[PDB]
A paper describes a structure:
Cyt c6 is a small, water-soluble protein (~12 kDa) that contains a heme group as its active center. As an essential electron carrier, Cyt c6 mediates between the cytochrome b6f complex and photosystem I (PSI), enabling electron transfer that is fundamental for sustaining photosynthesis by maintaining the continuous flow of electrons through the photosynthetic chain. The crystal structures of Cyt c6 from both species revealed a conserved fold, consisting of five α-helices, a bound heme group, and loop regions, which closely resembled previously characterized Cyt c6 proteins from other species. The heme was covalently linked to two cysteine residues via thioether bonds, and the central iron atom was axially coordinated by methionine and histidine residues, maintaining consistent coordination geometry in both oxidized and reduced states.
High-resolution X-ray diffraction data determined the three-dimensional structures of reduced Cyt c6-7942 (red-Cyt c6-7942) at 1.7 Å resolution, reduced Cyt c6-6803 (red-Cyt c6-6803) at 1.9 Å resolution, and oxidized Cyt c6-7942 (oxi-Cyt c6-7942) at 1.4 Å resolution (the crystallographic statistics shown in Table S2). Crystal packing analysis indicated that the dimers in red-Cyt c6-7942 and red-Cyt c6-6803 crystals formed higher-order assemblies. The tetramers and dodecamers were essentially composed of repeating dimeric units. Structural comparison of the peripheral and central dimers within the Cyt c6-6803 dodecamer also revealed consistency, with RMSD values ranging from 1.330 to 2.149 Å. The dimer interface of Cyt c6-6803 showed significant differences compared to that of Cyt c6-7942, being less extensive and lacking contributions from residues near the methionine axial ligand. Additionally, the distance between the iron atoms of the two hemes in the Cyt c6-6803 dimer was 17.0 Å, compared to 15.4 Å in Cyt c6-7942. The Cyt c6-6803 dimer exhibited a larger Fe–Fe distance and weaker dimer interactions compared to other Cyt c6 dimers. Notably, when one monomer of Cyt c6-6803 was superimposed onto Cyt c6-7942, the other monomer exhibited a 20° rotation relative to Cyt c6-7942, indicating a significant difference in dimer assembly.
Numbering used by the authors:
A (entry chain A): -1 to 85
B (entry chain B): 0 to 85
Write the structure that this text describes.
């Protein structure tokens, strides 16, 4: 495994897992982190997940200034990898 | 009571997305059950108004989005449901 992925996993647990436990979505069940939902919303890329983390959307807050760009890349890679291999 | 029905309406419009049925899917250790409010020192009008105003963790604040009067109505609704059982 990658050290970046393991680092992204830890950042995910601290910042994302309460709302996206197991790649789901507590608030909005139509916007999970499953690959099919990511693809249906054009979010199945590192750049699009980083943009989502940075700006947020709807009931998801933005993390600009609270998570470094480098850490955002790590968590984006963690999410996409889990999505591709199945949460 | 015009206050409790109004608080119910403000709750449906602002809190039900995360606290439907008095639960808390994001953080299941912090529901709106009276027992959880007691466990966190939140079983009071003053404490719930502060929570609404400032938020905490994954809960946003509502300052400027809900009037002070409506916040008191929401707090009374929550405590009434908590006491009766959601
Ligand atoms: C609750 C306060 C959340 C936090 C913390 C995190 N996410 Fe989120 N996310 C949340 C909601 C309510 C939504 C839907 C927003 C909308 O406007 O509909 C999302 C969405 C996403 C997505 C898009 C999913 C899709 O299109 O299927 C992604 C990729 C995503 N969220 C990622 C993500 C990350 C990496 C987080 C930790 C930094 C994170 N979210 C936190 C709710 C909340
Ligand atoms: C998700 C975007 C939320 C919305 C909208 C509302 N609440 Fe919330 N609430 C949420 C979380 C994640 C938490 C736990 C916060 C933490 O730091 O751990 C809470 C907590 C409360 C509490 C305390 C409950 C307890 O057992 O201690 C109360 C009294 C509360 N929330 C009330 C409340 C009201 C009245 C809302 C509508 C104005 C509201 N919340 C919206 C998540 C979210």
């Amino acid at each position: 495994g990658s050290a970046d992925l393991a680092h992204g996993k830890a950042i995910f647990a601290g910042n994302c897992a309460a709302c996206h436990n197991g790649g789901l979505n507590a608030i909005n069940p139509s916007k999970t982190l499953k690959m099919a939902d990511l693809e249906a919303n054009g979010k199945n890329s590192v750049a699009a997940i980083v943009a989502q983390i940075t700006n947020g959307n709807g009931a998801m807050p933005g993390f600009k200034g609270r998570i470094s760009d480098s850490d955002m890349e790590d968590v984006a890679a963690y999410v996409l990898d889990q999505a591709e291999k199945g949460w």
